[PDB]
Amino acid sequence: ADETLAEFHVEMGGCENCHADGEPSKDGAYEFEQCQSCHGSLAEMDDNHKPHDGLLMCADCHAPHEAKVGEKPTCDTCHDDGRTAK
Ligand code: HEC
Ligand code: HEC
Numbered sequence: 001a002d003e004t005l006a007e008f009h010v011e012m013g014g015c016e017n018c019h020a021d022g023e024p025s026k027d028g029a030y031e032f033e034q035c036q037s038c039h040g041s042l043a044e045m046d047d048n049h050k051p052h053d054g055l056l057m058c059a060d061c062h063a064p065h066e067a068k069v070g071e072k073p074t075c076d077t078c079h080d081d082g083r084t085a086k
């Protein structure tokens, strides 16, 4: 009974946590911005987030409307070279 990431954040704010007047962006960048305050920039993260920093958005990896808090994305969901999480 795990709650989605979008949920965990909601309880900590609402649907407006990554949505303006309930109007999801039609790109992804606009949202990716929201994930740049209480957290920071990938270029300011581990050596695992850096490598990506400037490639794919958070959600893109931390599928909010799908993933569930406490669920480390799988590299197999992109990398097929045995890539493993560190
Ligand atoms: C950030 C932590 C989010 C919160 C809080 C909620 N949603 Fe969300 N939603 C988020 C992203 C990043 C995206 C897409 C942009 C991307 O980077 O891919 C979305 C998209 C939606 C959609 C799209 C509908 C579709 O056509 O698939 C809907 C309908 C939506 N979001 C609704 C929604 C609701 C109801 C929320 C509160 C329960 C909510 N979102 C919170 C990120 C985040
Ligand atoms: C403040 C308004 C926030 C914004 C904007 C975003 N997140 Fe956030 N997130 C916030 C808090 C207070 C916390 C708790 C821990 C912490 O101090 O950061 C979190 C936690 C997450 C996590 C944790 C995942 C886990 O394994 O527990 C993730 C993956 C996460 N947040 C992702 C995320 C995304 C994708 C956002 C934009 C769509 C985003 N955060 C915005 C507060 C805030």
Ligand code: HEC
Binding pocket: 035, 039, 040, 041, 042, 049, 052, 056, 057, 058, 059, 060, 061, 062, 072, 073, 074, 085, 086
């Ligand atoms: C896939 C290429 C990812 C993208 C893009 C982002 N993150 Fe991530 N993140 C990823 C993994 C695989 C993990 C866990 C590693 C494992 O397998 O154990 C994480 C973890 C985090 C955490 C945990 C730290 C904490 O909650 O205290 C945070 C806070 C986090 N990721 C935030 C974050 C943000 C803000 C991103 C966009 C700027 C982002 N991640 C992108 C994989 C990926």
Ligand code: HEC
Binding pocket: 048, 051, 052, 055, 056, 060, 061, 073, 074, 075, 076, 077, 078, 079, 083, 084, 085, 086
């Ligand atoms: C798709 C959503 C991805 C997921 C899931 C993860 N990564 Fe990724 N990463 C992605 C792309 C598109 C690229 C580069 C694209 C290209 O072909 O140029 C990368 C790159 C890396 C690298 C850099 C390798 C290098 O050349 O030095 C590393 C080290 C890396 N990715 C690690 C990694 C790990 C450990 C993941 C699972 C926790 C992971 N990535 C997931 C896109 C995506």
